[PDB]
Paper text:
We solved two high-resolution cryo-EM structures of AasS liganded with C10-AMS inhibitor (2.33 Å) and C10-AMP intermediate (2.19 Å) in addition to its apo form (2.53 Å). In addition to the two controls we introduced, (i) AasS alone and (ii) its complex with C10-AMP adenylate, we focused on the complex of AasS liganded with C10-AMS inhibitor. Unlike the two controls that are characterized with a dimension of ‘140x150x80 Å’, the inhibitor-bound AasS architecture is relatively compact, because that its dimension is only confined to ‘130x140x65 Å’. As for apo AasS, its AasS_C domain colored pink, appears in an ‘open’ orientation. Presumably, the AasS monomer adopts an ‘open’ conformation to accept the sequential entry of various substrates ranging from decanoic acid, ATP, to holo-ACP. In brief, the pitcher-like AasS_N domain consists of three β-sheets flanked by α-helices, and provides a centrally-localized cavity for substrate entry. Whereas, the small cap-like AasS_C domain contains one two-stranded and one three-stranded β-sheets surrounded by three α-helices, hovering on top of the AasS_N active sites.
The acyl-ACP synthetase (termed AasS) of the zoonotic pathogen Vibrio harveyi recycles exogenous fatty acid (eFA), bypassing the requirement of type II fatty acid synthesis (FAS II), a druggable pathway. Very recently, the AasS (533 aa) of V. harveyi was found to feature a large domain at N-terminus (termed AasS_N) that is connected with a compact C-terminal domain by a flexible linker. As expected, a hexamer ring-like overall structure was invariantly formed in all the three types of AasS particles, regardless of a cofactor/inhibitor. Obviously, the pattern of AasS oligomerization is recognized as a trimer of dimers, which mainly relies on two interfaces constituted by the AasS_N domain.
Numbering used by the authors:
A (entry chain C), B (entry chain B), C (entry chain A): 4 to 533
Write the structure that this text describes.
Amino acid sequence: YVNDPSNYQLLIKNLLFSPVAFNPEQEIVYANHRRHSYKTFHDRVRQFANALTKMGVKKGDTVAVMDYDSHRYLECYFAIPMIGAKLHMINVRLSPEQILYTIDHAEDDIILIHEEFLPILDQIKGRIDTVTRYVVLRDDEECEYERLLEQESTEYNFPDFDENTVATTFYTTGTTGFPKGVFFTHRQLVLHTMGILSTIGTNASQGRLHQGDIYMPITPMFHVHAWGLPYMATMLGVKQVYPGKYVPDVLLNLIEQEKVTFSHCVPTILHLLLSSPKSKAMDFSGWKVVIGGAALPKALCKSALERDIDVFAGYGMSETGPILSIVQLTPEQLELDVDQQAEYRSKTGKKVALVEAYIVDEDMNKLPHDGETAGEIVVRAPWLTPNYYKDNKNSKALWRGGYLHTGDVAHIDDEGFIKITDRVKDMIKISGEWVSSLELEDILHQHQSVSEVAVIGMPHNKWGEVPLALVTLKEDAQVTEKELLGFAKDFINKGILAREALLLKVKIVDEIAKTSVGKVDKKELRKLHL
Amino acid sequence: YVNDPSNYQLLIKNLLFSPVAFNPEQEIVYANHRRHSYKTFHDRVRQFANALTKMGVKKGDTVAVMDYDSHRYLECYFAIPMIGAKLHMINVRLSPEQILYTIDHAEDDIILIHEEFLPILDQIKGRIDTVTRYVVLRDDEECEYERLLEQESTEYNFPDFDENTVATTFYTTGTTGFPKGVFFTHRQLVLHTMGILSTIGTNASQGRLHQGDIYMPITPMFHVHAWGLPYMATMLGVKQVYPGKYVPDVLLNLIEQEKVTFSHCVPTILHLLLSSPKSKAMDFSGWKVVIGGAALPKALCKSALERDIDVFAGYGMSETGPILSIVQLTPEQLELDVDQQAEYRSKTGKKVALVEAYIVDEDMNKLPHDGETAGEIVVRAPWLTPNYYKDNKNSKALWRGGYLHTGDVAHIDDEGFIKITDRVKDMIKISGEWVSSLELEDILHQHQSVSEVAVIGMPHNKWGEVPLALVTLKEDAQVTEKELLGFAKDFINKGILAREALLLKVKIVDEIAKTSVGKVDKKELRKLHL
Amino acid sequence: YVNDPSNYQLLIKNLLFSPVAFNPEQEIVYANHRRHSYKTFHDRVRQFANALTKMGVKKGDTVAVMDYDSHRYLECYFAIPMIGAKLHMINVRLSPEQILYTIDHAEDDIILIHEEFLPILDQIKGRIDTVTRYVVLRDDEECEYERLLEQESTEYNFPDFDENTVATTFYTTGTTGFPKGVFFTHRQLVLHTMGILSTIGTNASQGRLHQGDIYMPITPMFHVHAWGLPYMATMLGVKQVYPGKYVPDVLLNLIEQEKVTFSHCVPTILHLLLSSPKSKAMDFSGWKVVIGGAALPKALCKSALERDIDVFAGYGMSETGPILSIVQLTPEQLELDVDQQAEYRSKTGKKVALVEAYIVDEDMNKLPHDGETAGEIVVRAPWLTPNYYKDNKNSKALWRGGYLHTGDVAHIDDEGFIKITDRVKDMIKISGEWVSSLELEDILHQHQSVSEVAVIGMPHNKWGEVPLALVTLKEDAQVTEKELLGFAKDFINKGILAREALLLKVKIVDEIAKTSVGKVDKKELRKLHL
């Protein structure tokens, strides 16, 4: 590759070696395990580059990583792409067969795997080909990664190449029969970091990330590049703390002792942290957790707001950067009380810089943003995956009509706020309208003797797909289906026949199938019940 | 596509419409079901082309087929490639998960499936994407294929395109963790037909296929294009009989009544046909079955020769055309008695026209053809798959050193005869030599109280991989491991320590794992026992 | 040239070193002169390659050959093309001026010429340029070719190149004012060999070439690559005998002593062999001569059939491979008596594999194959010359309408049999119909006092071109033109005015002009008489 120095390429090496702020004394902390300055971080990155070069990794090669959140993952986030190789992030929460399929599909050359992830490999070891070396990662000095790093020198001349070379890749289950692989380039990652920093960094007084913060992820970090946060924090040169195993008590201790101010987690982890007895006497009025997993509930937002936590939501769908929208509060919205606060903070949010985000039905129409007309979200951003890896027809459906299809049905307010109502496949197509099953699930969950509710659709000649409810009862709770029918019929304000209460067809089931991540298997319930 | 008429392209349409001999009165017979002349066959091919065009199949599309041997499969062998689409042959003997993986990998658009293969689809129906239409095939008039054909006209202008467009594809399990997809072009198929017709058609008086024969396959016909035989017979314009379900009594009745003279099957089916009571009073002295499945045994060849059957072996490995070598007997070899006949007819054979077939060790050396020096077979033929579909590193190992690697270890006689001794992965690497486990399996199977034997290797510091035997005993047979050790030690004439009898390590196991095809799972036994 | 080993090229070296059968003990025999095994043949081919390399012959060079049928011509058929050079076959039966024109047009670099062809060169020696070396060939040890071969080693690495490189070329007089040069590639020759072997090798019991035959050409072998037979026999590894001078007694002795079973000759040579006194006590019931020169007569076929000779006809026109059609007899046609045998064996035949062979008038229409509608034969085959060398407008007329024009007018039966009736230029265009002069020549030759007859056309205002007969009388035979007119008028069953007997215009001429090959100079008779 030959490049004229006038022509500038957006590379991750520019993100690391030309940050907004660089403090050599700033420290990266791995929880109760290790602590080293930014200068040591740069030296270790160069050592890792030398070690990867020594093992035969080249520009076209792929390196797979399988561990928790640590300094090693942060070093892999940089060193591998800067060599030019591909960083394959493996979802350790998938089934061993799916993990093996992803490894075979991506054709990884070297695998770095944590010690306590070894049994998962042990049952798919012989099935794996195309892999030459396994590096075992440990939390003590007997780590193979540490022994590999301590042999190399801290001197590397990082090459310059085209900004469109692929840097990272990972696989998402989605709704297809096999996991789909998404990929991004150096330019896309750099632009995502810059745009999100411009969006959330310029807010007046709420939900802003600045150079005085202390960062600590609470998301798995093999999903969606941990929302791009580790790239951003390194760009700001802020203190970074990595917890590892995600134990609520260790997390609370790290927040108290390291003075963490910025984080991102999911509603389940936030609820566990808030309900922990250790947290009842902990100061929380400096913390700005970002909830992005799925559908931050209003009650959880209220409970966090009563603890003086700047909690706000964001949207990302694992092939869109991921960040597309974040709730931002104008100064006259900060003076509202906790109910109006929790109303706004639980929304999907306004689109971030350089995002279009139209609402569109089938045949691509541009339904207005009145605030109640729902439709599928289609976006155009500088950091979208062009297609699926080694796929043709799903790639065509992904970019149908010239826009990326999110698969989420939402309505957009006149002021720009987005409120996601359901998923495209989960919409019940009664007659000629489209009701969202989420509000029926919420209504049925309001019952005192109901634990979990799943709503699906079953064919019906005159009224299309009609709804069906599977409910799980509580301890020593036995309410007949007629009682639940009356409970749902009690509510008002909905369309269709009367209030669409003649076809609820609620049934009581002991258990509801869930994915390996922990999400209801609506497809399967469809297979089981129809 | 624009072509100068002077420039000639080798296409399957030339194979069908410009045969060696064309008799409109010659008939194709589907067993006790249907019987129609060659003119009707051409009309049905044109009707199928029109029907496929009507459903939206185009040049780049793929059509999958799942049924037994019938006129419909013969029509699919032609019509789909002549449109320019890809014919994906699905192995119905694989597990449903493997079948689903192959369907997802090949991205089939339309699936033609037999009725009694429906349950297999029923458990993978929802997992399947990228498929638009399913056509159910039946043996009566309610077949969807027949109803689709009877609407179209018998008039089609078949296009002309580049001879390098892919025509057929199918998947082989091999030794990898996932099935590997191989593909061939129109030119390769035409050249394979022409070369094999030139090779076996020009023999003096034994094992020759000519225009007066009657053809009937006994191989699954989704493997290896049924050895290319259906293409060849259609080229010769000979009578063709398709049995379907492969029931030994129906097969014998078809051979008796249709006067079948040429066939290809596997040793198991041949043994079942020979041992059937119905066959004890059947005339067999016009039949020229070709055995190509795997390792035709000498005893079976003798038993068939005592029934006046011209039985001979052929070699094909599912990515080599498949035909690479066929045994051909010189006129002074026909005067030998049954023992010398069965010696020669059970060999791998001499290479067919336009085949190189060298013997080669690691680092690619060209060990001489002395008759006892074993090595891996590497070939160069006009009908080899260039690589594996959507694969990189296995493709590199397939064509390592500039030759296609068969994976079979054999020795070549000075006269050109090849004798396959084992598989590359199944070789036991004791010390510095390579013993073949097949002869030890044969020796141990010679015991009176032994049913089946599997030989594997287990590590040993001073002598590399050493052999281990897993044996299954007969009804009320109990012989200790020491007795089998002495039985193996009784024989002579082998190298290594004494006769390599200090490490046999024979063990008795109730059952031995087998593939879905019925072959021992040596990899698994390795996983289970070590 | 760089080639990926996966990409296979069809080369003559593959035809020689990868045959159907290779027997090192099989011998090539030059009549009463030399006899050497196939291993010696391969060694001599390598030696000739080394010798040609030593003289400066390169890929683009051309080597001309001028001799009879011998081992040297067979070695030139292989060695020259395998180097990549062009083999120019010179017709030694042409006039010295035509030979000189062909040499100048083809620009030969080295000329190999037999001793007794030296006088022909002596009168055109000074006129020749662009030629650097002359190699004199002799039948004794003083041959320059033998002395050149005995210096080189038997070791050559034959290169691999594109399959579309030109291999052979030769010149045909045709109907143009100067000889026209045709050329073929390696791929075309290999495909011709494979296709004809597939066509004639797969016949049931008549007219088949197999690996147990003994081959001996009786055609000049500088015409039409000797019908491709020497390439085919070498591919089958059969014994080959080369007679040389074509003396009938030497030919009969070779057939008797070498046990020749397959041959190809012309009707004149066959008649000379059958009428020889030596042949009256010779066994002929193993011989399968192929007649392909021109228009095998029915009487000669009957006479050969009474001698128990499997005599059959073939069609080739010197720019079509040459083989296009061969008569093949179905098993129920072998049971007919000698008259019906001679009827079928004298026909042009059915088209061989991969040949289209439509019948077409001017403006390219596709007149039906009823069996009596005549038209010009146009073909599409994998082994047709794209054009004439260094020619433009004749090349356009050769491939007019997208098909190669044979120049022969024939009718095709409903069963596929072709019967050539005349040449396009020799058709008499009376009024609005086209009569063939061949049947009038046959009718007039039936007279008892007639030796030879030539029919031409002369203008006539109201009836287009009308026929004219030039006849030669026998010894002391004097029949007036009126007697011949009445003799022709006696016959019946023809169209046009009455029986087209009012314009015969028969004339008696002492001699009729003939080409240097021995064919009537109809153009010249047109020039002389009109």
